[PDB]
């Protein structure tokens, strides 16, 4: 879907300012812990079977930071993200078996790090144009599934 | 389903809520009504503009029923049987309704209580959050 | 996702004997009783309070056959399904705010109608073709609300 | 949640599958293999032909224990207890999976039982086979 003008502008305030070292970590770290069957996709990385084991995981912060600019690409070419996305999306079908479910999980999970760091200034606008853009990744994560 | 610990990091965050429950439950609605401007069809009856009475009101309720059900945390089809004969027979509330609002509730929690919202208790209120909407949405009269 | 040629064919095959003014109607029923905040969305059908009477109403049947009938259309452009939904997957989403969850839930309830009339016959080879075919109308009817 | 209708209902469904529950079992576990190749990626360790000694051994195991599930249906987390640490803690199962396997049973009591699966006892079953899978996926130590 478009993003409005306005919607396009709040995108691109708020991402100047993340922590791009912290708030990959975090969300994906949140996922293992809140939706704990998703712990069995990433059994290489080590002790998982408690949330203090999940958030204190080195391997699992390192990953988070590459799922991030993944994110950050998408937000440059958001009237093709299907082109964009279209080598990742095979592979999370033909390699991982990734349940496109999972990935609806995840943009939430994203969403609720950013309120957890911007506080006040994630107002219901900021929000609801990243509602957006979570949505549009998703579907173009999934869209070779089909 | 809910264990021991999971009752006890419910308890926990709701005492920090204190005083307040009443404006998170009506935080929580304006997001949900702007962020997925469906939701805004069960409610054709209502003002929806920030800051509206009816919204306010409204917030409270949705708060309260909150409360008790923490409060009668061991029995919750018990505690909550009126409200599930509303949501089920009546209103006929779709459940992706409650997933979109469960969302919008935790970042409302996640804003307002960054140092009591860690990983593990959001855990456990994702769960109690989806306990209660099971039951709303279930029909055991 | 393409069907093989034995997989087309299993198709073909049971479609040829299905009660037309019959399986689009139980299909559609059973959606309504087994998820019952389905009943919102046909609200000017009538009663639809308990189990016996969402069985017996007319409207349900009648709307029922339609659908199939749409079904039916699909099996003959299996290689261009979201040219064919292009106009019926607008109407869902702008007119109709249908949450695409939904779909899922009929295609396999019309699986469930199938495996009740055809018995020793609905083979787990024969769900398999099936299987796809439920999916990718689903999928095609999605397409626009992205 | 289940409702005295619904332990009724779903007590009638089982009183009609009678001394059958096994091989039900393991009808719905090929059905759920061969058209969601994913789910065979559990079970490295089986030979999944048809007919295979092992499908039938382990769709034995899955018939008994819903037949327990039945006769202790008041209290499911208490006569559960042991299962959920084996699907929760240890195999780490995505809930989608237990989605695919409930409709394959369904779809196996449909075949076989098309007199007594009604719609008002297919939404019973519906509910009772979710309820199990909540159970199953749930971790209360
Ligand atoms: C927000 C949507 C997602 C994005 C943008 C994303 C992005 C990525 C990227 C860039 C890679 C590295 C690709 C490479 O090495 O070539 C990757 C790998 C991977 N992803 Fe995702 N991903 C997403 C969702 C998910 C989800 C929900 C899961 C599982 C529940 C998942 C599981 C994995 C796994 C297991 C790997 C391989 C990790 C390894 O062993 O190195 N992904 N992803
Ligand atoms: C945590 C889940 C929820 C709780 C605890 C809750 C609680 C309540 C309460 C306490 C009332 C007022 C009952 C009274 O009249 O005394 C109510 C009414 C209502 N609810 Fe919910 N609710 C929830 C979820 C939802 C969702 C997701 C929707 C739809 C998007 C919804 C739609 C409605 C509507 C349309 C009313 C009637 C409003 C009025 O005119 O008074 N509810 N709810
Ligand atoms: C299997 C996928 C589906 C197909 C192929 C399908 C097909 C159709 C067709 C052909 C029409 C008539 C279009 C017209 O009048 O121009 C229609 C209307 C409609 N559909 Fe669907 N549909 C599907 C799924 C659903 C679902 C899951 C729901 C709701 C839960 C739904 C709700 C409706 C409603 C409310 C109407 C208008 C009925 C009326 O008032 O006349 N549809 N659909
Ligand atoms: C109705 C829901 C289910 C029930 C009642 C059930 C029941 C059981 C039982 C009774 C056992 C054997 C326990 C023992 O060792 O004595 C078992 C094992 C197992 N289950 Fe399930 N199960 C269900 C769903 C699932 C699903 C959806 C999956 C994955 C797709 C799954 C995967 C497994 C695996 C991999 C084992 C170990 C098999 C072995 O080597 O013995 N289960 N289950």
Same mark, same amino acid.
């Given at each position: 879907?478009?993003?409005?003008?306005?919607?396009?502008?709040?995108?691109?305030?708020?991402? /100047?300012?993340?922590?791009?070292?912290?708030?990959?970590?975090?969300?994906?770290g949140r996922?293992?812990?809140?939706?704990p069957?998703?712990?069995?996709?990433?059994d290489?990385?080590?002790?998982?079977?408690?949330?203090?084991?999940?958030?204190?995981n080195?391997?699992?912060?390192?990953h988070?930071?590459?799922?991030?600019?993944?994110?950050?690409?998408?937000?440059?070419?958001?009237?093709?993200?299907? /082109?964009t996305?279209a080598?990742?999306?095979?592979?999370?079908?033909?390699?991982?078996?990734?349940?496109?479910?999972?990935?609806?999980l995840?943009?939430?999970?994203?969403?609720?790090?950013?309120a957890?760091?911007?506080?006040?200034?994630?107002?219901?606008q900021?929000?609801?144009?990243?509602?957006?853009?979570?949505?549009?990744?998703?579907?173009?994560?999934?869209?070779?599934?089909? | 389903?809910?264990?021991?610990?999971?009752?006890?990091?419910?308890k926990?965050?709701?005492?920090?809520?204190?005083?307040?429950?009443?404006?998170?439950?009506?935080?929580?609605?304006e997001?949900?009504?702007?962020?997925?401007?469906?939701?805004?069809?069960?409610?054709?009856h209502?003002?929806?503009?920030?800051?509206?009475?009816?919204?306010?009101?409204?917030g409270?309720?949705?708060?309260d029923?909150?409360?008790?059900a923490?409060?009668?945390?061991?029995?919750?089809?018990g505690?909550?049987?009126?409200?599930?004969?509303?949501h089920?027979?009546?209103?006929?509330?779709?459940?992706?309704?409650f997933?979109?609002?469960?969302?919008?509730?935790?970042?409302?929690?996640?804003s307002?209580?960054?140092?009591?919202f860690?990983?593990?208790?959001?855990?456990?209120?994702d769960?109690?959050?989806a306990?209660?909407?099971t039951?709303?949405?279930?029909?055991?009269?």
């Amino acid at each position: 879907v478009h993003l409005s003008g306005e919607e396009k502008a709040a995108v691109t305030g708020l991402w /100047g300012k993340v922590k791009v070292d912290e708030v990959g970590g975090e969300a994906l770290g949140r996922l293992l812990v809140v939706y704990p069957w998703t712990q069995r996709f990433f059994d290489s990385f080590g002790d998982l079977s408690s949330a203090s084991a999940v958030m204190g995981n080195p391997k699992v912060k390192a990953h988070g930071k590459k799922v991030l600019d993944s994110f950050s690409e998408g937000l440059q070419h958001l009237d093709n993200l299907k /082109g964009t996305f279209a080598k990742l999306s095979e592979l999370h079908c033909d390699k991982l078996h990734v349940d496109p479910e999972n990935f609806r999980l995840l943009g939430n999970v994203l969403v609720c790090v950013l309120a957890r760091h911007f506080g006040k200034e994630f107002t219901p606008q900021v929000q609801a144009a990243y509602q957006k853009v979570v949505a549009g990744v998703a579907n173009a994560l999934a869209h070779k599934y089909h | 389903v809910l264990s021991s610990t999971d009752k006890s990091n419910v308890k926990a965050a709701w005492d920090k809520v204190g005083g307040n429950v009443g404006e998170y439950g009506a935080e929580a609605l304006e997001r949900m009504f702007l962020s997925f401007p469906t939701t805004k069809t069960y409610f054709p009856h209502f003002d929806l503009a920030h800051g509206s009475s009816q919204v306010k009101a409204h917030g409270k309720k949705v708060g309260d029923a909150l409360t008790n059900a923490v409060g009668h945390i061991d029995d919750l089809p018990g505690a909550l049987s009126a409200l599930s004969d509303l949501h089920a027979y009546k209103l006929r509330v779709d459940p992706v309704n409650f997933k979109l609002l469960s969302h919008c509730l935790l970042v409302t929690l996640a804003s307002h209580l960054p140092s009591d919202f860690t990983p593990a208790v959001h855990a456990s209120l994702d769960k109690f959050l989806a306990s209660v909407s099971t039951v709303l949405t279930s029909k055991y009269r």
